[PDB]
Write a protein that binds this ligand. Structure first.
Ligand SMILES: C[C@]12CCC(=O)C=C1CC[C@@H]1[C@@H]2[C@@H](O)C[C@@]2(C)[C@H]1CC[C@]2(O)C(=O)CO
Lengths: 12, 249
């Protein structure tokens, strides 16, 4: 749940 | 028919402003903390760019994370070189439209050497008169130029993407020149530049590592950048990372 992983999986 | 180069142009993010706070003691510590806050936001922009980069999403998620964590400083310094080339012909460090640093202000403690190193990268854009399309293709290749010695989880996909953008660099060169006499010479020069980026950024990364670990320097880092460095730094210092070079070292 790192911030980078979250961003890679996020929609936009 | 749409082309890869036209897509690289359309997905390139707009330049960020710092929001700089000129109303304070221009200390070395505050400037470095300001630069790291800008850097963290630029890395967020670069992650969104990578998600839009044709082919990148085909990589295993773990490889996507590895490549971004390993190459972020190369991407940031290369783009800084480009802005400083276009906005000042390599004379000033153009971090953002509201944060332009001339080398008199680089006299601040711990600032002289790193600013000389950043200026050297910009000076290569000036020397070679790099075109925008050449820059965009080279920047993709930097995202794809530092890998674990033990390999990636989706190696075959990675090999294909990298070869695709090597070809695209060749196409950008052919477009830059309504002729033929210099195409190979130009490809040689630009791949020599790519190879040289590993060493040209190495001092910047080592300095960043030291300010990250040495908390008594009181330099602040934003959250996602701190997470990235905390993962990248042990791998680099342990010698588990290798650059992908075009030419004999
Ligand atoms: C990404 C960054 C900020 C945004 C930008 O346009 C270009 C760069 C590349 C050089 C980076 C810089 C900042 O982050 C501060 C850094 C890391 C510097 C290298 C050494 C540095 O000054 C420090 O290590 C300060 O802690």
């Amino acid at each position: 749940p790192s911030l980078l992983k979250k961003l890679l999986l996020a929609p936009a | 028919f749409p082309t890869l180069i036209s897509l690289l142009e359309v997905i390139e993010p707009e330049v960020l402003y710092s929001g700089y706070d000129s109303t304070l003691p221009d200390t070395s510590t505050r400037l470095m903390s300001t630069l790291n806050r800008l850097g963290g936001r630029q890395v967020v922009s670069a992650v969104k760019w990578a998600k839009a980069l044709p082919g990148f999403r085909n990589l295993h998620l773990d490889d996507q994370m590895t490549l971004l964590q390993y190459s972020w400083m190369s991407l940031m310094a290369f783009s800084l070189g480009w802005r400083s080339y276009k906005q000042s012909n390599g004379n000033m460090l153009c971090f953002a439209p509201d944060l332009v640093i001339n080398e008199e202000r680089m006299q601040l403690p711990y600032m002289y050497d790193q600013c000389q190193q950043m200026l050297k990268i910009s000076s290569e854009f000036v020397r070679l008169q790099v075109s925008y399309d050449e820059y965009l293709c080279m920047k993709v290749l930097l995202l794809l130029s530092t890998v674990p010695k033990d390999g990636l989880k989706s190696q075959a996909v990675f090999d294909e993407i990298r070869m695709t953008y090597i070809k695209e660099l060749g196409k950008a060169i052919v477009k830059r020149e309504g002729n033929s006499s210099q195409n190979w010479q130009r490809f040689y020069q630009l791949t020599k530049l790519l190879d040289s980026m590993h060493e040209m950024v190495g001092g910047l990364l080592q300095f960043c590592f030291y300010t990250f670990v040495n908390k008594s320097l009181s330099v602040e880092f934003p959250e996602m950048l701190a997470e990235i460095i905390s993962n990248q730094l042990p791998k680099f210092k342990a010698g588990s990372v290798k650059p992908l070079l075009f030419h004999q070292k």
